[PDB]
Amino acid sequence: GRYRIRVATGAWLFSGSYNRVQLWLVGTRGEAELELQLRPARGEEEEFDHDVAEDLGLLQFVRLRKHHWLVDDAWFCDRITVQGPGACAEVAFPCYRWVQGEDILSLPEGTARLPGDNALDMFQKHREKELKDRQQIYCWATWKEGLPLTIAADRKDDLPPNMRFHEEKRLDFEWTLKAGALEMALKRVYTLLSSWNCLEDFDQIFWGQKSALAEKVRQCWQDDELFSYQFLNGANPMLLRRSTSLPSRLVLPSGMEELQAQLEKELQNGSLFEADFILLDGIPANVIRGEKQYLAAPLVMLKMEPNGKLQPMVIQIQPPSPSSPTPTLFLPSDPPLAWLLAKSWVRNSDFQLHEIQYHLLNTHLVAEVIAVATMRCLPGLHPIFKFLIPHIRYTMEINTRARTQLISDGGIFDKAVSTGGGGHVQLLRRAAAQLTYCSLCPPDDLADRGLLGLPGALYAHDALRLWEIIARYVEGIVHLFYQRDDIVKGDPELQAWCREITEVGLCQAQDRGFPVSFQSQSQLCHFLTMCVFTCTAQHAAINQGQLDWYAWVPNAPCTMRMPPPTTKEDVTMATVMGSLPDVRQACLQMAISWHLSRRQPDMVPLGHHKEKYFSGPKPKAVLNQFRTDLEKLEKEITARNEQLDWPYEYLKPSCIENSVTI
Amino acid sequence: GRYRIRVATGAWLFSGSYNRVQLWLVGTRGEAELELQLRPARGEEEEFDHDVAEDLGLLQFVRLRKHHWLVDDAWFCDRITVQGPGACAEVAFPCYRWVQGEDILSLPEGTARLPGDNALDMFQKHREKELKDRQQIYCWATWKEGLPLTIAADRKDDLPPNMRFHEEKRLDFEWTLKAGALEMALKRVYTLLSSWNCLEDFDQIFWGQKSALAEKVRQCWQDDELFSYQFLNGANPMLLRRSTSLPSRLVLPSGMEELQAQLEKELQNGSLFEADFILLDGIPANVIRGEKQYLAAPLVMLKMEPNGKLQPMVIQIQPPSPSSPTPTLFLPSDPPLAWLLAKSWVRNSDFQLHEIQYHLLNTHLVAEVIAVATMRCLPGLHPIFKFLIPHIRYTMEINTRARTQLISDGGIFDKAVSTGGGGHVQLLRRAAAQLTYCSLCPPDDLADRGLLGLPGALYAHDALRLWEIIARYVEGIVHLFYQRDDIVKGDPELQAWCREITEVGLCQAQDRGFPVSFQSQSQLCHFLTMCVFTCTAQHAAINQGQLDWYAWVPNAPCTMRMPPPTTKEDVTMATVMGSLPDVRQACLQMAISWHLSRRQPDMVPLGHHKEKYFSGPKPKAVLNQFRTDLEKLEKEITARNEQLDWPYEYLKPSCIENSVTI
Amino acid sequence: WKEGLPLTIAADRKDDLPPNMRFHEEKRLDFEWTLKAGALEMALKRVYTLLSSWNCLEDFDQIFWGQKSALAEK
Ligand SMILES: COc1cccc(CNc2ccc(S(=O)(=O)Nc3nc4ccccc4s3)cc2)c1O
Ligand SMILES: COc1cccc(CNc2ccc(S(=O)(=O)Nc3nc4ccccc4s3)cc2)c1O
Ligand SMILES: COc1cccc(CNc2ccc(S(=O)(=O)Nc3nc4ccccc4s3)cc2)c1O
Ligand SMILES: CCCCC/C=C\C/C=C\C/C=C\C/C=C\CCCC(=O)O
Ligand SMILES: CCCCC/C=C\C/C=C\C/C=C\C/C=C\CCCC(=O)O
Ligand SMILES: [Fe+2]
Ligand SMILES: [Fe+2]
**Residue A410 and residue A396: Cα distance in Å, rounded?**
21
Give backbone dihedrals phi and psi of A317, rounded to 5 degrees, phi first.
-70, -40
Residues with a CB atom less than 6 Å from ligand 2: B 176-177, 180-181, 412, 415, 584, 588, 591-592, 595
**Residue B91 and residue B82: Cα distance in Å, rounded?**
5
Burial label for A189, CB within 10 Å (0-12, 13-18, 19+), is exposed
What is the helix (H) or strand (E) element at residue A227, kind and residue range? helix A224-233
Cβ distance C65 to B179 less than 8 Å, yes or no, reads no
Residue B558 carries which side chain, given as an amino acid letter?
Answer: C
* Ligand 2 nearest-atom number relative to CA B584: 15
In this complex, the residue of B182, B193, B208 whose CB is nearest that of residue C40 is B193
**Residue B439 and residue B353: Cα distance in Å, rounded?**
14
Residue among B7, B14, B42, B49 with most chain A CBs within 10 A, to mutate: B42
Q: Write b or e for each residue in B479-501: b if 16 or more Cβ atoms lie within 10 A of its Cβ, otherwise e.
A: ebbbeeeeebbebebbbbbbbbb
Return the closest-CA partner of residue B114 out of B422, B508, B482: B482
Cβ distance B193 to C73 less than 8 Å, yes or no, reads no
Angle at B405 between CA B399 and CA B410, to 5 degrees: 130
Return the closest-CA partner of residue B296 out of B310, B281, B275: B281
Residue A354 carries which side chain, given as an amino acid letter?
Answer: H
Contact B378, B391 (CB under 8 A): no
Residue B180 carries which side chain, given as an amino acid letter?
Answer: G
Contact B148, B403 (CB under 8 A): no
Instruction: Write the CA distances from A592 to A24, A178, A367, A546, C21, integer angstroms.
Output: 48, 12, 20, 8, 62
Instruction: Write the CA distances from B496 to A638, B133, B508, B511, C18, integer angstroms.
Output: 55, 16, 14, 19, 93
**Residue A63 and residue A20: Cα distance in Å, rounded?**
14
Cβ distance A39 to B10 less than 8 Å, yes or no, reads no
Return the closest-CA partner of residue A311 out of A358, A268, A263: A263
Beta pairing partners, B80 = B7, B93
**Residue A277 and residue A249: Cα distance in Å, rounded?**
11
- Contact list, B45 vs chain A (CB under 8 Å): 43-45
Chains touching chain C, criterion 3+ CB pairs below 8 Å: A, B
Resolution (A): 2.2
Q: Tell me the residue ranges of DSSP E strands in B557-635.
A: none
Question: What percent of chain C is helix, strand and coil (3-state, nearest 5)?
Answer: 60, 0, 40
**Residue A406 and residue A408: Cα distance in Å, rounded?**
6
Return the closest-CA partner of residue A346 out of A557, A199, A549, A550: A557
Shortest Cα–Cα distance, A368 to chain C (Å) = 30
**Residue A328 and residue A343: Cα distance in Å, rounded?**
13
- Contact list, C55 vs chain A (CB under 8 Å): 71-72
Residue whose CB lies within 8 A of the most ligand 5 atoms, among B399, B413, B596, for a mutation test: B596
Contact A340, A348 (CB under 8 A): no
Contact A234, A541 (CB under 8 A): no
Cβ distance A43 to B42 less than 8 Å, yes or no, reads yes
Return the closest-CA partner of residue B208 out of B183, B233, B188, B174: B183
Cβ distance B43 to A605 less than 8 Å, yes or no, reads no
Helix segments in B482-538, DSSP class H: 485-489, 492-499, 521-532
**Residue B29 and residue A546: Cα distance in Å, rounded?**
56
Q: Write b or e for each residue in B197-215: b if 16 or more Cβ atoms lie within 10 A of its Cβ, otherwise e.
A: eebebbbbbbbbbbbebbb
**Residue B435 and residue B497: Cα distance in Å, rounded?**
19
Experimental method reported for this structure: cryo-EM
Instruction: Write the CA distances from C17 to A490, B275, C8, C21, integer angstroms.
Output: 86, 68, 11, 7
**Residue A91 and residue A85: Cα distance in Å, rounded?**
12
Contact A337, A322 (CB under 8 A): no
Contact B251, B325 (CB under 8 A): yes
Atom 12 of ligand 5: nearest residue by CA position: B402
Shortest Cα–Cα distance, C25 to chain A (Å) = 48
Residue A448 carries which side chain, given as an amino acid letter?
Answer: D
Query: What DSSP assignment string belongs to B315-363?
Result: EE-S---SS-SS--EE-TTS-HHHHHHHHHHHHHHHHHHIIIIIIIIII
Task: Please indicate if any CB of chain B lies within 8 Å of the CB of C65.
Answer: yes
**Residue B384 and residue B497: Cα distance in Å, rounded?**
10
Beta pairing partners, B37 = B20
**Residue A327 and residue A251: Cα distance in Å, rounded?**
7
Residue A129 carries which side chain, given as an amino acid letter?
Answer: K
Contact B183, B208 (CB under 8 A): yes
Return the closest-CA partner of residue B432 out of B196, B79, B31, B145: B145
Atom 25 of ligand 2: nearest residue by CA position: B185
Beta pairing partners, A7 = A46, A80
Residues 6+ apart with CB under 8 A from A364: A395, A398, A399, A402, A539, A660
Judge if the beta carbon of residue C11 lies within 6 A of ligand 3.
no
Residues 6+ apart with CB under 8 A from A167: A11
Task: Please indicate if any CB of chain C lies within 8 Å of the CB of A71.
Answer: yes
**Residue B451 and residue A168: Cα distance in Å, rounded?**
50
Residues 6+ apart with CB under 8 A from A301: A243, A250, A263, A266, A272, A273, A274, A312, A313, A314, A315
Task: Please indicate if any CB of chain C lies within 8 Å of the CB of A41.
Answer: no
Residue whose CB lies within 8 A of the most ligand 1 atoms, among A174, A175, A177, for a mutation test: A177
How many angstroms does the Cα of residue B357 sit away from the middle of ligand 7? 12
Instruction: Write the CA distances from B424 to B110, B234, B427, B435, B654, integer angstroms.
Output: 44, 22, 5, 15, 32
Instruction: Write the CA distances from A571 to A114, A220, A333, A339, B442, integer angstroms.
Output: 66, 21, 14, 9, 90
Task: Please indicate if any CB of chain C lies within 8 Å of the CB of B12.
Answer: no
Q: Write b or e for each residue in A150-185: b if 16 or more Cβ atoms lie within 10 A of its Cβ, otherwise e.
A: bbbbeebeebbebbbbeeebeebbeebeeebeebbe
How many angstroms does the Cα of residue B425 sit away from the middle of ligand 2? 22
Give backbone dihedrals phi and psi of A189, rounded to 5 degrees, phi first.
-65, -40
Q: Which residue of B has its CA nearest to A44?
A: B43
Contact A430, A413 (CB under 8 A): no
Hey, how many other C-beta atoms are within 10 angstroms of the C-beta on A133? 12
**Residue A56 and residue A30: Cα distance in Å, rounded?**
5
Give backbone dihedrals phi and psi of B2, rounded to 5 degrees, phi first.
-95, 100
**Residue B623 and residue B613: Cα distance in Å, rounded?**
12
Residues 6+ apart with CB under 8 A from B299: B247, B249, B250, B274, B275, B276, B277, B278, B315, B316, B319
Beta pairing partners, B275 = B300
